[PDB]
Design a protein around this ligand. Structure first.
Ligand SMILES: [K+]
Ligand SMILES: [K+]
Ligand SMILES: [K+]
Ligand SMILES: [K+]
Ligand SMILES: [K+]
Ligand SMILES: [K+]
Ligand SMILES: [K+]
Ligand SMILES: [K+]
Ligand SMILES: [Mg+2]
Ligand SMILES: [Mg+2]
Ligand SMILES: [Mg+2]
Ligand SMILES: [Mg+2]
Ligand SMILES: [Mg+2]
Ligand SMILES: [Mg+2]
Ligand SMILES: [Mg+2]
Ligand SMILES: [Mg+2]
Lengths: 122, 50, 117, 203, 155
RNA sequence: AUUCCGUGAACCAUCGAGUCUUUGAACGCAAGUUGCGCCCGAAGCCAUUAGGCCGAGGGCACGUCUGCCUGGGCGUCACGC
RNA sequence: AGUCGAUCCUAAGGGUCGGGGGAACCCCGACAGAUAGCGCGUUUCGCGCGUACUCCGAAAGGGAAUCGGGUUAAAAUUCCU
RNA sequence: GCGACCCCAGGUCAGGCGGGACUACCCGCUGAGUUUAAGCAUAUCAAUAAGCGGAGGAAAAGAAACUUACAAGGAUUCCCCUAGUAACGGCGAGCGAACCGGGAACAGCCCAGCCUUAGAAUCGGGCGGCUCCGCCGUUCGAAUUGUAGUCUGGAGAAGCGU
């Protein structure tokens, strides 16, 4: 009778929404029982129902976000909420290629006269 | 006053909720040091100063 | 060009409506103030029961953000009952209470019995 | 092959041609706001030699600053202190006018980076400079190895830290040796180093 | 903007103009200017499409044609650097200078250089027209280094 | 509650997925006001190449850079009338 | 609580754009300026007007609309008729 | 009336950037007096406290328009010494560096300008692909009032040989 997350992931959006509606109705009934001097057995179910509602909402949200990420894959100008967060400073940084850019003379210098491997023995 | 703003009324509601004695079962907790509600307030002793 | 007004007025230029290349928010947000979130629980005090018995009125504790129209819609959705009028107030404890009077076509006592109060 | 001609002509500021052009330009600048963008530099060669390039991401702003010294801003010119500090007028700001112009441009244009500036015109009441700024976020700037260094975070608000050419001038860094040694790495840093009382473990 | 741009013209008219700047107020005559521009219209530089077509044709015919020789093109020269270099090297045969260059210090000295090098020069109206000649928004000046055989006498 | 020989307890540990109310540099205008405006719009009601009600939800600050659209001024010109 | 108030209006004044000052925190405050927009008909485009703040500022100034009768332990011109 | 350019105006136009927070160190500005001088005004306190701004993991400085006068050293920074010295100072109270020398660490470079003109060889945006911090193709735009390339005084261009 307990909710299993791995079983929720195998359900469709409509079934998840129906289960969420049923859980919300049960939670409302439990609140009514609580306000009407309900027994401790009914009161203990409030936590279970709230956990089930949270689990269903989490599964729905994760499925939707995965779908959106797949839809926006291999595409530029993603929604801000779907872009990497990191930090502000890191986001502002120059790319690795931009950091490695150099003038033609510097490239010629590194190609012609790199630091050689040498030893001092003989 | 009878005329009060919504924000002030909500703050007063929170202050009323915070003005109560501690639950009895708090004193039975393992390694408990709380004896009573040290932040109790009476409308005639200390004013909220809003 | 002939100008009849000494005062210069800025000419009207075309403006374009926004056509963003990407949506700033990936998907619309969830509806937090649904019928279950609007109606917290019925009030079962002596005054509430007296109201139910006498004025055909139900007393509910409601989300502080809910307005009278939302309360009426939530009551209709939850219990399928018309409402003659909704009166609301904010209690000293900071929660919102609503006096929901049903139409004569609906009996408050039967609705309360169905709810479980 | 034309920039040398322009530079040599601009070295002749007392010539009739230059006087006429500068008079007209000064009049025109007097009528406009203190800070305003210019589509292109009016001194192309000077801008080149100061690092400007005619490519996207480079902009030039004309900045107008007031002339004269710095009157001590105390009410009614009253100083509460010893006579040595009682002076009010004939006091001088430690920073140059072009530094003030660069600071005004940088504060006004917070989304850009100040690169350099140059004198263009002046009257008895105002001095005029154009400030070269760089849009570090532009791809053209970020893909140019000679300038994309300005995009690194260490160069934020160079003008407000005295890191521009005018900054180095007014910080006493344009010379080296016995006449300038107290200015490096900084005057305050040198003072802190000189005042430090070193107490070693084995004294 | 309108008030300032009109008052600038008024002030320029009122003040005394030094001869070096005053020489730019005497442009070519309408008939002479029209003839010169008609001559120039047939020496325009190739546009982007024409350049791409020529490049692709040369690439296609490179190996097959064993790089056939092509006659040296005869087109007008533009760009202040290049024009000044050509004048200094005595390669230019005619220098066309716009009268409305701003800042005018860029070309105010050009007539003196042309005179010292004994290169005929003219001041015409419209940097925009000069740019249109060379497919640009504006052109400070244009130069002709050589002309075709059929045009030598009129040139 | 938990096939406690196990998709599995924990007021356990750790982090990659997700939620994240009103504000605040705070950004439609304000503020001792949950006060006062404008725009887009899913689903639904009947309404049918027509428009209406409702509203989930989201937008409308300032200064700037690049590009663009729409414009003004004999400011500089040219072609016609 | 559609009817009592806030909410709306503006008072002395406050806060501001632009501009002018200012090293800067900031100062003056519609005074250095292409104002907001508003009406008519519509192929949603055209026509005509358009003096630089459509912001804050009164639970005693101005101002859309409710009266009896009844009712609670505690609310009412708000609940019932 | 049309067209080209210039300057400027309006856009909830497409895509970006900025404000603010923290304090031990770091960079810029502004800036006292208590106090000492057995009084006090120059001086001292102090190029400090307070005040106003700007960064990073370090900052700043940095590749000689230097030090020296030697048989010469050779970017910058820091430590020891120079040295409580030269000097400054109602030459009073007080204040006070630098070079050489020995160590820690070491690293050098990029531009502007005369020099493609047998064609801007340069760069940005959109679109479509790819082994996607980027590359390729196409199309618009920036740019001749100059983007690429060469050159930076230690050199360098050009020419001839290896
Ligand atoms: K003193
Ligand atoms: K208001
Ligand atoms: K100002
Ligand atoms: K004002
Ligand atoms: K009133
Ligand atoms: K009544
Ligand atoms: K391209
Ligand atoms: K170059
Ligand atoms: Mg006007
Ligand atoms: Mg003082
Ligand atoms: Mg302003
Ligand atoms: Mg109003
Ligand atoms: Mg550094
Ligand atoms: Mg000694
Ligand atoms: Mg040493
Ligand atoms: Mg591209």
């Amino acid at each position: 009778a307990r909710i299993k997350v791995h079983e929720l992931r195998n359900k469709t959006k409509t079934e998840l929404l129906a289960q969420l509606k049923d859980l919300k109705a049960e939670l409302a009934l439990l609140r009514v029982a609580k306000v009407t001097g309900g027994a401790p057995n009914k009161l203990s179910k409030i936590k279970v129902v709230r956990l089930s509602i949270a689990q269903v909402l989490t599964v729905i949200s994760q499925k939707q976000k995965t779908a959106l990420r797949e839809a926006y894959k291999n595409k530029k100008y993603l929604p801000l909420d779907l872009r990497p967060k990191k930090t502000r400073a890191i986001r502002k940084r120059l790319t690795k290629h931009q950091v490695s850019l150099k003038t033609e003379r510097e490239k010629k210098k590194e190609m012609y006269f790199p630091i050689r491997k040498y030893a001092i023995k003989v | 006053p009878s005329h009060k703003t919504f924000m002030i009324k909500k703050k007063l509601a929170k202050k009323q909720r915070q003005n109560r004695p501690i639950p009895y079962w708090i004193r039975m907790r393992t390694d408990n040091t709380i004896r009573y509600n040290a932040k109790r307030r009476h409308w005639r002793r200390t004013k909220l100063g809003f | 060009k002939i100008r009849t007004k000494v005062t210069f007025h800025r000419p009207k230029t075309l403006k374009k409506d926004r056509n963003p290349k990407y949506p700033r928010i990936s998907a619309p947000g969830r509806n937090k103030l649904d019928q279950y979130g609007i109606l917290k629980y019925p009030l079962t005090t002596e005054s509430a029961m007296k109201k139910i018995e006498d004025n055909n009125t139900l007393v509910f504790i409601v989300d502080i953000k809910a307005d009278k129209k939302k309360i009426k819609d939530a009551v209709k959705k939850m219990y399928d009952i018309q409402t003659k009028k909704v009166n609301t107030l904010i209690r000293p404890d900071g929660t919102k209470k609503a006096y929901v009077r049903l139409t004569p076509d609906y009996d408050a006592l039967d609705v309360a019995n169905k709810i479980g109060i | 092959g034309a920039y040398t001609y322009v530079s040599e002509l601009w070295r002749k500021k007392q010539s009739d041609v230059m006087r006429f052009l500068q008079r007209v330009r000064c009049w025109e600048y007097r009528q406009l706001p203190s800070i305003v963008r210019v589509t292109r530099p009016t001194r192309p060669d000077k801008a080149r030699r100061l690092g400007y390039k005619a490519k996207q991401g480079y902009v030039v702003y004309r900045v107008r600053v007031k002339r004269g010294g710095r009157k001590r801003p105390v009410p009614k010119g009253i100083v509460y202190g010893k006579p040595t500090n009682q002076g009010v007028t004939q006091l001088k700001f430690q920073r140059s006018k072009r530094s003030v112009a660069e600071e005004r441009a940088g504060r006004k244009l917070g989304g850009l980076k100040v690169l350099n500036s140059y004198w263009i015109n002046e009257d008895s009441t105002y001095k005029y400079y154009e400030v070269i700024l760089v849009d570090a976020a532009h791809a053209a700037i970020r893909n140019d190895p000679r300038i994309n260094w300005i995009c690194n975070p260490v160069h934020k608000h160079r003008e407000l830290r005295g890191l521009t050419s005018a900054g180095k001038k007014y910080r006493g860094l344009r010379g080296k040796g016995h006449l300038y040694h107290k200015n490096r790495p900084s005057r305050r840093g040198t003072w802190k180093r000189n005042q430090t009382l070193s107490l070693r473990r084995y004294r | 903007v309108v008030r300032i741009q009109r008052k600038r013209r008024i002030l320029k008219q009122r003040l005394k103009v030094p001869p070096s700047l005053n020489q730019f107020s005497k442009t070519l005559d309408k008939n002479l200017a029209t003839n010169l521009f008609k001559m120039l219209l047939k020496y325009r530089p190739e546009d982007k499409a024409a350049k791409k077509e020529r490049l692709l044709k040369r690439a296609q015919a490179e190996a097959e044609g064993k790089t056939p020789e092509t006659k040296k093109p005869i087109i007008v020269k533009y760009g202040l650097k290049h024009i000044t270099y050509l004048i200094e090297q005595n390669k230019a045969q005619l220098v066309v200078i716009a009268h409305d260059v701003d800042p005018i210090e860029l070309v105010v000295w050009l007539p003196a250089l042309c005179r010292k090098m004994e290169i005929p020069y003219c001041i015409v109206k419209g940097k925009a027209r000069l740019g249109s000649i060379v497919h640009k928004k504006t052109a400070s000046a244009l130069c002709l280094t050589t002309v075709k055989n059929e045009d030598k006498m009129e040139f």
